[PDB]
Amino acid sequence: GIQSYCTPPYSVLQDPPQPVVWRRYMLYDCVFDFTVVVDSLPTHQLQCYGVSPRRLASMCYGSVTLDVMRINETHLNNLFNRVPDTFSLYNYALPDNFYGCLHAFYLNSTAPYAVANRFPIKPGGRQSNSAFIDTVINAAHYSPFSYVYGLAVITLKPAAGSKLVCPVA
Numbered sequence: 001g002i003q004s005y006c007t008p009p010y011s012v013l014q015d016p017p018q019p020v021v022w023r024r025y026m027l028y029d030c031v032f033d034f035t036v037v038v039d040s041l042p043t044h045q046l047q048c049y050g051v052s053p054r055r056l057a058s059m060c061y062g063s064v065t066l067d068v069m070r071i072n073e074t075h076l077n078n079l080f081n082r083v084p085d086t087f088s089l090y091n092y093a094l095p096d097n098f099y100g101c102l103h104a105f106y107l108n109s110t111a112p113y114a115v116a117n118r119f120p121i122k123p124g125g126r127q128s129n130s131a132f133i134d135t136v137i138n139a140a141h142y143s144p145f146s147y148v149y150g151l152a153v154i155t156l157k158p159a160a161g162s163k164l165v166c167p168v169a
């Protein structure tokens with residue numbers, strides 16, 4: 001039938017959360033403007049797995065997940081090369097057999113960079129203890145600031161019947 005439009009996360013895109021509190025947005029059974037999280041963004045690095053970047057925003061999917069946070073160059077490079085570090089061990093980790101895209105874009109901002117460096121998370125997981133999270137965010141104030149990129153992790157699910165996420169033209 002006639003699908004609704006998914007609302008793009010403009011607000012979180014103009015101010016990405018600290019990686020310790022990365023945010024997820026789930027897109028399902030809707031029309032979505034992919035340009036907001038791809039073309040319109042000032043791209044620093046776009047890396048895709050299971051799909052080409054030129055094909056990404058042109059087809060439909062079973063579902064689309066957007067994970068948004070900030071990330072500095074070291075952690076970004078380790079993320080791309082799949083090398084373990086504090087970011088992927090304690091803050092945000094790609095799921096097994098990741099199908100989708102990593103989109104890093106310019107924020108032109110060197111700021112407090114709140115990254116957990118203890119208490120391991122599982123892939124696709126997050127820190128859940130609010131007290132500890134608060135200590136990480138607080139500790140960010142008393143540690144070197146980092147020059148930082150925005151990061152949108154786009155997880156794709158293959159189309160399988162009706163109720164899809166389709167791009168706007």
Ligand SMILES: *[C@@H]1O[C@H](CO)[C@@H](O[C@@H]2O[C@H](CO)[C@@H](O)[C@H](O)[C@H]2NC(C)=O)[C@H](O)[C@H]1NC(C)=O
Pocket residue numbers: 072073074075086113115117146147
């Ligand atoms: C990105 O931020 C991390 C901290 O979240 C920085 O990590 C430090 O990196 C140096 C080497 O450059 C290590 O000796 C330190 O032990 C690291 N500290 C922690 C707490 O992990 C990293 O340097 C930052 N990268 C940039 C380019 O600013």
